[PDB]
């Protein structure tokens, strides 16, 4: 058990025990004979059981039980010495630090501070951070935790200690988000940026994913945080990225989140009509605009055109997939069918010529 | 690890994370929607991550890890309460008594005296 050597050399032959008793009688009544048998320190005097305990401690190596090794000094009473020598060999543990304040408060503080290091090299940074929290080392309990690549617990501790207006918590959010940027987890990065009371970059990091659903969610987030033009740009960008597989009406309703993409809405209507034509038109277009989009009056029919003539697309060279080529052609056709009525036909014929030239240029027959 | 529930309901589908981000944006800018998802307490405010930690603690029974259960209150800061309730259920341990003198000397004395009985 705790003293295997004593119980081993205490159940010997009866003659051995008789000799031990004789030696004890000789030593008690008065002494190099008692030195050979250390266990008589249990009965002889105080100066001998100390040596017996020391022998037991140095014998407590082969069984790998440093807890009893360090507890024996508590019986001897040298708590300070065993605490000091335990950290040097990397043997300080929770058991030893339990009686750390027995010798004094400063002794306990030294014990926990030293145990923090060993827990650091023993992949126990959470326990170390808790121990630094014990002496109310609030600021230090988070820097090592985040440096050890543990941001969730660090932020939890910082919020538990520090008030929300503290400057040493937003840095945790920004650092965790920046780390997550390269990891490809843009949603949680946007969450971290949102929690850092700076949502301007949250929409951008959410949009950085590139998926149409991610683009739309970034648009909605930017609308929520008050970035109206940013949300409008995000919706416009998700519009084309939604049209690839089979989605036409989904992008039609996605363009509705802000009241600045009505021209894009009626252009994507032409996209749908031209795509269906691949399975008159100039009047069916405006009829569908009147019916579905509920825009039937010359009044706004001009101001819905002036916002569509202000944007220009690239030259649309030969090397490009036909999708955005058709999108640009249909946008120009929409501009033509707009300008054909409220003004002279010069703009209509010019826009029709522009559309036909764009279609011809990119080798598209 | 220490918070299996958070890392479980934090690696969900991308649409779920987008909805969580939308709810966080709605709650930050001003709220019964944030109550359903407790992990937003990590980002929302102080009054919510306390409830998240409490939920984690009450979920720390099925895995049989009372050490983390009692360490979570150290993060929350109620060392006295966790020390007092640990002895009643027979869960006071060497780890808990390590930070016993953090709240005070008499607290440590009570902690060791109570741990003596359980031992």
Numbering used by the authors:
A (entry chain A): 847 to 876, 884 to 1132, 1155 to 1240
B (entry chain B): 847 to 876, 884 to 972
Please, what does the article write about this entry?
To understand the mechanism underlying G5C self-assembly, we solved the structure of G5C by cryo-EM at an overall resolution of 3.31 Å based on the gold-standard Fourier shell correlation (FSC) curve. Consistent with the result from the SLS experiment, G5C forms a homodecamer with an MW of ~750 kDa. To our surprise, five G5C molecules (A–E or A’–E’) form a pentagon-like structure via its C-terminal region, named the pentamer region thereafter. Consistent with the previously solved TPR dimer structure, A–E forms homodimers with A’–E’. Thus, 10 G5C molecules assemble into a decamer comprised of a dimer of pentamers. The distance between the two parallel pentagon planes is ~177 Å with a rotation angle of 36°, and the rotation angle between the projections of two protomers in a TPR dimer, such as A and A’, is 108°. At the protomer–protomer interface of the G5C pentamer, an intermolecular five-helix bundle is formed by α28 and α29 of one protomer (molecule A, red) and α26, α31, and α32 of another protomer (molecule B, cyan), mainly via hydrophobic interactions, with a total buried accessible surface area of ~1400 Å2. In addition to hydrophobic interactions, intermolecular hydrogen bonds or salt bridges are found between Gln1378A side chain amide and Ser1472B main chain carbonyl and between Gln1389A side chain amide and Glu1462B side chain carboxyl. In the structure of the G5C decamer, two G5C dimers are spaced apart from each other, with the RBS1 of one G5C molecule (molecule C) spatially proximal to the positively charged surface of another molecule (molecule B), such that a large positively charged concave surface comprises residues from RBS1C and TPRB. Several basic residues of TPRB, including R1035, K1061, K1062, and R1090, are spatially close to RBS1C around the unstructured region between helices α26C and α27C.
